Amino acid sequence: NHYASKKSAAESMLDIALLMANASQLKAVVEQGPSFAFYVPLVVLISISLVLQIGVGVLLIFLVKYDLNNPAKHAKLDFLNNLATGLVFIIVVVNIFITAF
Amino acid sequence: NHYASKKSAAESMLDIALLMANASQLKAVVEQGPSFAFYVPLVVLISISLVLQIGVGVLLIFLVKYDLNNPAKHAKLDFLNNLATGLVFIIVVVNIFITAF
Amino acid sequence: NHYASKKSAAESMLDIALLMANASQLKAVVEQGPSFAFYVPLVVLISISLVLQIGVGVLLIFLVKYDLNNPAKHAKLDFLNNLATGLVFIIVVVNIFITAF
Amino acid sequence: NHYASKKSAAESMLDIALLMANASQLKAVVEQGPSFAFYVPLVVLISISLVLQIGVGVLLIFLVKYDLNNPAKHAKLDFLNNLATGLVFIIVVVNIFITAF
Amino acid sequence: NHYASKKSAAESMLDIALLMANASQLKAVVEQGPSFAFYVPLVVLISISLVLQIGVGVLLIFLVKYDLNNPAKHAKLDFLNNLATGLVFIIVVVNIFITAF
Amino acid sequence: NHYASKKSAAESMLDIALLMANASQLKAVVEQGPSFAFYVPLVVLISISLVLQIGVGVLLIFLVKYDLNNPAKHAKLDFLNNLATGLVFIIVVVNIFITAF
Ligand SMILES: CC(C)CCC[C@@H](C)[C@H]1CC[C@H]2[C@@H]3CC=C4C[C@@H](O)CC[C@]4(C)[C@H]3CC[C@]12C
Ligand SMILES: CC(C)CCC[C@@H](C)[C@H]1CC[C@H]2[C@@H]3CC=C4C[C@@H](O)CC[C@]4(C)[C@H]3CC[C@]12C
Ligand SMILES: CC(C)CCC[C@@H](C)[C@H]1CC[C@H]2[C@@H]3CC=C4C[C@@H](O)CC[C@]4(C)[C@H]3CC[C@]12C
Ligand SMILES: CC(C)CCC[C@@H](C)[C@H]1CC[C@H]2[C@@H]3CC=C4C[C@@H](O)CC[C@]4(C)[C@H]3CC[C@]12C
Ligand SMILES: CC(C)CCC[C@@H](C)[C@H]1CC[C@H]2[C@@H]3CC=C4C[C@@H](O)CC[C@]4(C)[C@H]3CC[C@]12C
Ligand SMILES: CC(C)CCC[C@@H](C)[C@H]1CC[C@H]2[C@@H]3CC=C4C[C@@H](O)CC[C@]4(C)[C@H]3CC[C@]12C
């Protein structure tokens, strides 16, 4: 099976529990309604968190391939790693505030 | 039997359990009625998910052929693998939200 | 007997068990009546699958002849195999939905 | 402006007048209601017609490539032209019935 | 415009006045209902007539291409022309009966 | 000023009048209410169109640099151009359907 091989290499560029955690709390706040406090900050915090994770996922997909095919661009490769590290860093900050609120 | 060989080679370019999972809940949400909540997001999420899987399968069918007949275009083949990985990646992200909602 | 030889070679160009499977539900959905839910999506889904199986079978009949008589046109023969695989891939996707619905 | 250059090349691979004609009548039949006759055959005919135009467009987009970059694979190139011609041939036949109904 | 060129090339493989006539009378007999006599023969004759025209059109698309790319197989091309001529012969015979009834 | 040059180089990578059109129609459909018909298809089509426009903008931003610094990999650049053309094709189809509805 070729799709399973693609699926295995596609789940290796992200985590599963956090999106399941993110989706479950996004679902809970939606049904409760705008009457509940912190509705507006929670929706935007989840939305920006999901977008950043998607951007990191596509970033990681195209990054590990440079680790094998052509590592000549030593300077460029490190800068991409730091950007991925920084994007994950801001992701966990939103998740810290999401759980707190 | 020549059709059996085609079916085996075409069933190996995708997964089956996920497609039945999408179709089973698609019937459930459609027959349940628009009155129940999350009807609209589930319908569009399943619809876009199914469309991408067809595109991935079509992408994969024309992909494994180049792995044997002519591997000279390494750059084009390597990028095509990355695009397939990204499309599968966004499929599992949508599927995570479908089960949650 | 020459017709028996043609029948054997023509039955190898398609699958058999699925055909009565498609035919049996087509009779059931037609006999039960339009009042039964999901009637309309069932007829079109069965109809398109039946049309595509005929196209695939016709494609398979004219394809194996080139495999022995004249295999020089490798590029054209290779693409025909991919088209046959892609067409069958649509068949398996569609049949999943009739089974689910 | 680079986007407009892409748009000009992308509009050269399809027709606009038929698409608005298909979309205008799709809106009319949908908004009119299922009470009027020929509701279903019109919807499925437009739907299969619309899918084929997208399939023709992507076929034509990747077909202009081979006429200039590498015309060495002639036999594959002529066959792809016939498939592109065949796909459009079905589209006009379908549109004839849409106009009549 | 490349789609217009394909449409023009696919327009030369069939006629318009006959298809619109067939579709117009198909709508008339269908709307009137089975109460009006000759309903069953009219539907089947129009149905088989339309099927052959698509087969003739697809036949003509793949036939004129051999007239220019590779005319070496004169014997096979001659037989194909007779089949196309024969297929048109039954089409015009069938259409005579549709007008008569 | 260095920010003005970046603004010009970023505005040259996309079309703007379509952006005011999309924003205005989105505001209209959002404000006038869900009671209006075609509300949901309009909203989802506008959303996917905007997402695709951002994707095309990013593609063009990262592709224009590739045209000058290192043109050695012709195949990858040409395939990226084809992908951008197809994305603009689907964007213009979605915008046609938005205008129709
Ligand atoms: C804009 C930032 C802050 C968030 C969004 C990030 C996403 C959409 C973008 C921004 C930077 C982009 C990367 C920039 C450079 C490269 C190197 C190239 O050879 C492969 C693609 C890759 C790896 C890009 C992938 C997409 C990318 C990760
Ligand atoms: C339009 C994109 C974003 C989503 C839909 C993907 C489908 C419709 C398209 C987009 C990319 C396409 C592929 C791009 C390149 C090639 C290499 C060619 O030698 C065989 C076909 C193949 C493999 C194409 C098949 C069709 C394809 C898979
Ligand atoms: C039109 C498409 C999308 C669906 C219908 C498929 C049928 C009607 C058509 C489309 C492509 C066609 C094939 C194209 C090329 C050849 C190779 C030739 O040596 C024998 C006929 C054969 C094998 C054709 C048989 C009929 C065929 C299979
Ligand atoms: C599945 C068929 C019957 C209908 C849908 C057609 C679309 C989705 C598919 C089927 C055949 C495909 C083409 C097959 C071969 C080529 C030649 C290659 O150099 C570029 C991609 C291109 C041009 C593909 C693009 C996508 C394509 C046009
Ligand atoms: C079976 C007959 C009586 C009716 C149906 C006709 C259609 C479906 C079939 C039957 C014979 C077929 C043709 C047989 C041989 C060729 C020559 C080849 O170079 C291109 C395809 C082409 C032109 C085929 C196209 C499809 C075709 C015309
Ligand atoms: C996922 C696809 C189908 C739609 C979304 C497109 C965006 C998110 C992605 C997918 C393809 C990506 C591009 C793929 C390849 C390259 C070439 C490199 O030199 C610069 C980055 C660039 C240009 C990427 C930028 C980000 C990109 C445009």
Three-class HEC string of chain A: CHHHHHHHHHHCCCCCHHHHHHHHHHHHHHHHCCCCCCHHHHHHHHHHHHHHHHHHHHHHHHHCCCCCCCCCCHHHHHHHHHHHHHHHHHHHHHHHHHHHC
Buried b (16+ CB within 10 A) or exposed e, E54-66: eebbbbbbebeee
- Indicate contact of F with E: 3+ CB pairs under 8 A: no
Q: What is the largest CA-CA distance in chain C?
A: 56
**Burial, E85: exposed, middle or buried (Cβ in 10 Å; 0-12, 13-18, 19+)?**
exposed
- Dist CA B101 CA B42 (whole Å): 7
Element (DSSP H or E) covering residue F71: none
Closest by Cα among A4, A1, A43 to A22: A43
Q: Is F62 in the pocket of ligand 6 (CB under 6 A)?
A: yes
Q: Quote the CA–CA distance of C93 and C52 in Å, as a whole number.
A: 12
Q: Are A98 and A42 in contact (CB under 8 A)?
A: yes
Q: Looking at the CA of F56, name the nearest ligand.
A: 6
Token couple for B49: 């998910």
Task: Tell which residue, A12, A22, A20, has the closest CA to residue B95.
Answer: A20
Q: How far is CA D100 from the centre of its chain?
A: 19
Q: Is the dihedral of CA B29, B34, B39, B44 positive or negative?
A: positive
**What does F4-44 look like in DSSP terms, one character per residue?**
HHHHHHHHTTS-SHHHHHHHHHHHHHHHH-TTSTTHHHHHH
Q: Is the dihedral of CA C78, C83, C84, C88 positive or negative?
A: positive
C84 within 8 A of C13, measured Cβ to Cβ? no
Cross-chain CB nearest to D4 (options F15, F82, F89): F15
Distance, CA of A29 to CA of B10 (rounded, Å): 42
Residues with CB under 6 A from ligand 5: C 58; E 55, 58-59, 62-63, 66
**Helix/strand/coil for F72:** coil
Half-sphere exposure of D28 (CA within 13 A, CB side): 11
| Residue with token string 């599927």 | B95
* DSSP string over E39-93: HHHHHHHHHHHHHHHHHHHHHHHHHTTTTTS----HHHHHHHHHHHHHHHHHHHH
**Tokens linked to F12:** 């040259």
**In contact, E44 and E37? CB cutoff 8 Å:** no
The SS3 call for residue E3 is: helix
Chain E interface with D: residues with Cβ < 8 Å: 1-4, 6-7, 9-11, 13-14, 16, 19-20, 23-24, 26-27, 31, 54, 57-58, 61-62, 65, 69
Q: Which of E8, F91, E3 is nearest to D13 (CA)?
A: E3
The candidate with the shortest Cα–Cα distance to A63, out of A79, A77, A75, is A77
Which structure tokens are listed for B69?
């007949």
Query: In the structure encoding, which two tokens stand for residue F29, read together?
Result: 């459909």
Are F73 and B75 in contact (CB < 8 Å)?
yes
Pocket (CB within 6 angstroms of ligand 2): B 55, 58-59, 62-63; D 58; F 86
What domain count does chain E have?
A: 1
The domain of C57 spans 2-100
Query: Which amino acid is it at A46?
Result: I
Max CA separation in chain D (angstroms): 56
Token look-up 């920084």 returns A86
User: Buried (b) or exposed (e) across C66-97, using 16+ Cβ within 10 A?
Assistant: eeeeeeeeebeeebbbebbbbbbbbbbbbbbb
User: In angstroms, rounded to a whole number, what is the distance separating the alpha carbons of residues A35 and A58?
Assistant: 36
Residue B46 near residue B97, CB atoms below 8 Å: no
| Structure token pair of residue D36 | 């009027």
Pick the residue whose CA is nearest to atom 15 on ligand 6.
Answer: F80
What resolution in angstroms does the PDB record give? 2.8
CA–CA separation, D13 and D16 (whole Å): 10
Query: Which residue has 């912190």 as its token pair?
Result: A38
Cα D8 to Cα C62: distance, rounded to the nearest angstrom: 40
**Contacts of the segment A75-84: beta carbons below 8 A, 24+ positions apart:** A83/A59, A84/A56, A84/A59, A84/A60
Q: Which experimental technique did the depositors report for determining this structure?
A: cryo-EM
In ligand 3, which atom is closest to the CA atom of C63? Answer: 23
User: Cβ(F56)–Cβ(D3) under 8 Å?
Assistant: yes
Token couple for B94: 């949508």
Helices (H), D1-101: 2-11, 17-32, 39-68, 74-100
Q: What would the two tokens of residue E4 be?
A: 């217009």
Q: Does any ligand 1 atom lie closer than 6 A to the CB of residue A79?
A: no
Angle at CA D44, nearest 5°, toward B51 and D13? 60
